From a paper:
In this article, we describe an application of hydrogen deuterium exchange mass spectrometry (HDX‐MS) to identify dynamic regions within type III phosphatidylinositol 4 kinase beta ([name]β) in complex with the GTPase [name]. All deletions were then combined into a single construct that contained two internal deletions, as well as removing the N‐terminus and the C‐terminus.
Using HDX‐MS to identify disordered regions and map conformational changes in the kinase [name]β bound to the small GTPase [name] allowed us to successfully crystallize this complex in the presence of both GTPγS and GDP loaded forms of [name] and to collect data to resolutions of 2.65 and 3.2 Å, respectively. This approach also permitted us to generate crystals of [name]β in the absence of small molecule inhibitors, enabling us to soak these crystals with the potent PI4K inhibitor [name], and solve the cocrystal structure with this compound. The hydrogen bond between V598 and the central quinoxaline is characteristic of many protein and lipid kinase inhibitors, as this mimics the hydrogen bond made with the N1 of the ATP adenine. [name]β has a larger binding pocket to accommodate the glycyl methyl amide group compared to the class I and class III PI3Ks. The wall of this pocket is composed of L383 in [name]β, which corresponds to a tryptophan in class I PI3Ks, and a phenylalanine in class III PI3Ks [Fig. 7(D,E)]. The clash at this position is likely to interfere with the ability of the central quinoxaline of [name] to properly hydrogen bond with V598 of [name]β.
Residue numbers in the entry:
A (entry chain B): 7 to 42, 46 to 68, 77 to 173
B (entry chain E): 128 to 221, 232 to 242, 306 to 404, 511 to 683, 694 to 782
């Protein structure tokens, strides 16, 4: 048996790699070639508890129904993805659960030479809204599991 | 994820990085490759600069933006690299126009030096003779020394330096054409890094102002003794041919193919000799050239001495028994076979003893790579004699070098065809007239043929070359 079943959601502009984050964290796989609603689950142990994380992925209100955690994934190689965070916030304010833990995610951190979003300025935005922050990379699995490990641990 | 295993692999170089960036329509792949560029050596990427900048201008916008970050980074580091980009962006444009205007927005001293040279050549259109032009040219170049040294450098030089002095008395117009080209000698001072050192100090009858046709070593010592900067160990002399009315873009493409062919034969351990001369594109109708020292056209050799090729060899090198002639002959054979493969693969036409040079060692060097491939408006007896007849043991060695040279040419045909295939992208060059110019290029390699059938190809190729 598993103790609880959380429902976290992956949103953001298409192309940030939220579909790859879903594969890396769960099935542990990443492909450069892309394709295209879908969700995948993997249970982890948190505080002596078994939690079946139900990660959702899109390509509205039904998307946010039962939503426990929120993952805003923006690209650090495309500043426009960081600009639309305010628009996605409005997307959350209107349909998402009033008490969901939003953890900002800066994917594609392996593109160190193509960085368009400052790591310190983006992390500061996480403090302005009191949201958890972390930059990941589904290509080399940097802070991939740590992202969901924290978002699932912070959900209590 | 096999593809990622390939990029992560050591087998992933700058050449293949351009391959995937040239074919892949995957934004994730393009952006990833645009990041790996920073990991490569600066030197390895520079060779494909004409390719990258060309892909940037004449391809999907999703491709150009991927290369832009790497390009901007290198421009912020090297003033020379900044100059190279600004020249190639405007030369192949007919998109990057908005980028060229910001790279130039420091390079004032350099740009002023290029315009002056090109301006000097243009005004020489009035003087109808080769002698008149050279008279006005020398007086014209003497004005440049009044504003030197300065933050100016010859990009054709294989090192950083500051142009200090210009021996105008040694300059000369090459021919009696309308927009005739002119060769100039430039005295420069080397350095650690151009973006580091400031402009050097400046220092000002009938001594060295003499113009003779002599070896490089002797022509430099004379210019040195008559030069104020000739006492510094940092001093060094360069030479470039300025063409203010010729499109050296196809010349640049031919250059890359020569270097690539040169590497292949060097890596496959095939003793073929070819000498690619550096090219510099200033625009779609101008540019400079660095001429190889101690080399003159065969036509100018048959004319100044009034002899045969074999006679000049025996006179300038020695008898058939002399070891000097043997080495000089070996240099001739390897150079012929080396450039024969170059003429066949590229389909170089308009081949005559005016476009074929000859150095002190005994090598031959082809020039003027116009009328190659699609564009268009031979083993002479004179050459066969120098190899000891058709049945000479050196002529058979010549046919053998072409075989194992063509064989090694197939083992790396991929890297070579890539150079030309990418450049055809959007270029209105005459060498890309036919719709299927790349196909004939690949078929001239004959990957389908066998080595037993290659010898027949080599033999039947030499026969028709007469
Ligand atoms: N360089 C790099 N590329 C990534 C990374 N994560 C994802 N990508 C690329 O981003 C592209 C699009 O991701 P995708 O799965 O479609 O995310 P989605 O658009 O949100 O559904 C894929 O082709 C991946 O190769 C990363 O960490 N580094
Ligand atoms: C001034 N004459 C000499 O220096 C004799 N020795 C040499 C030695 N290397 C050379 C390299 C390149 C060229 C060359 C190439 C392309 C040209 O336009 C297509 C060209 O026409 C200006 C000249 C001439 C060379 N000539
Ligand atoms: Mg997707």
């Amino acid at each position: 048996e598993y103790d609880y079943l959380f429902k976290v959601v992956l949103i953001g502009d298409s192309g940030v790699g939220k579909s790859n984050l879903l594969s890396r964290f769960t099935r542990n796989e990443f492909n450069l070639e892309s394709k295209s609603v879908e969700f995948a689950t993997r249970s982890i142990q948190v505080d002596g508890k078994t939690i079946k994380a139900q990660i959702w992925d899109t390509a509205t209100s039904a998307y946010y129904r039962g939503a426990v955690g929120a993952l805003l994934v923006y690209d650090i190689a495309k500043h426009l993805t960081y600009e639309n965070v305010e628009r996605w916030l409005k997307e959350l304010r209107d349909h998402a659960d009033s008490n969901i833990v939003i953890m900002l995610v800066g994917n594609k951190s392996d593109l160190r030479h193509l960085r368009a979003v400052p790591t310190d300025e983006a992390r500061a935005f996480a403090e302005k809204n009191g949201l958890s922050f972390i930059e990941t990379s589904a290509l080399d699995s940097t802070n991939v599991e740590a992202a969901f490990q924290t978002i699932l641990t912070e959900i209590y | 994820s096999w593809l990622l295993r390939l990029f992560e692999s050591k087998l992933f170089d700058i050449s293949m990085a351009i391959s995937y960036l040239y074919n892949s329509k995957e934004p994730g792949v393009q952006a990833y490759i645009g990041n790996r560029l920073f990991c490569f050596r600066n030197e390895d990427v520079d060779f494909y600069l004409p390719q990258l900048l060309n892909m940037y201008i004449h391809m999907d916008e999703d491709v150009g933006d991927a290369i832009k970050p790497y390009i901007v980074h290198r421009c912020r580091q090297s003033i020379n690299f900044s100059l190279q980009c600004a020249l190639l962006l405007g030369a192949y444009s007919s998109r990057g126009t908005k980028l060229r205007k910001l790279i130039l927005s420091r390079l004032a001293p350099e740009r002023e030096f290029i315009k002056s040279l090109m301006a000097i050549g243009k005004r020489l259109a009035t003087l109808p003779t080769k002698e008149q032009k050279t008279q006005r040219l020398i007086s014209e170049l003497s004005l440049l020394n009044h504003k030197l040294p300065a933050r100016v450098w010859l990009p054709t030089a294989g090192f950083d330096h500051h142009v200090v002095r210009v021996p105008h008395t040694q300059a000369v117009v090459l021919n009696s054409k309308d927009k005739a080209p002119y060769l100039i000698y430039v005295e420069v001072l080397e350095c650690e890094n151009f973006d580091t050192t400031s402009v050097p100090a400046r220092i000002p009858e009938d001594p060295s102002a003499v113009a003779l046709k002599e070896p490089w070593q002797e022509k430099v010592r004379r210019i040195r003794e008559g030069s104020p900067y000739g006492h510094l160990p940092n001093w060094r002399l360069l030479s470039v041919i300025v063409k203010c009315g010729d499109d050296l873009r196809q010349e640049l493409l031919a250059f890359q193919v020569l270097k690539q062919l040169q590497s292949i034969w060097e890596q496959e351990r095939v003793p073929l000799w070819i000498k690619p001369y550096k090219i510099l594109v200033i625009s779609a109708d101008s540019g400079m050239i660095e001429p190889v020292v101690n080399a003159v056209s065969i036509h100018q050799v048959k004319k100044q001495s009034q002899l045969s090729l074999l006679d000049y060899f025996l006179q300038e090198h020695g008898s058939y028994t002399t070891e000097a002639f043997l080495s000089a002959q070996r240099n001739f054979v390897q150079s012929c076979a080396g450039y024969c493969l170059v003429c066949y693969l590229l389909q170089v036409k308009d081949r005559h003893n005016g476009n074929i040079l000859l150095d002190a060692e005994g090598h031959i060097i082809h020039i003027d790579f116009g009328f190659i491939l699609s564009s268009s408006p031979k083993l002479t007896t004179e050459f066969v004699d120098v190899m000891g007849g058709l049945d000479g043991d050196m002529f058979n060695y010549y046919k053998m070098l072409m075989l194992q040279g063509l064989i090694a040419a197939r083992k790396h045909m991929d890297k070579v065809v890539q150079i030309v295939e990418i450049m055809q992208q959007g270029s209105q060059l005459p060498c890309f007239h036919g719709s299927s110019t790349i196909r004939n290029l690949k078929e001239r390699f004959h990957m389908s043929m066998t080595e037993e059938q290659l010898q027949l190809l080599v033999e039947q190729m030499v026969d028709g070359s007469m």
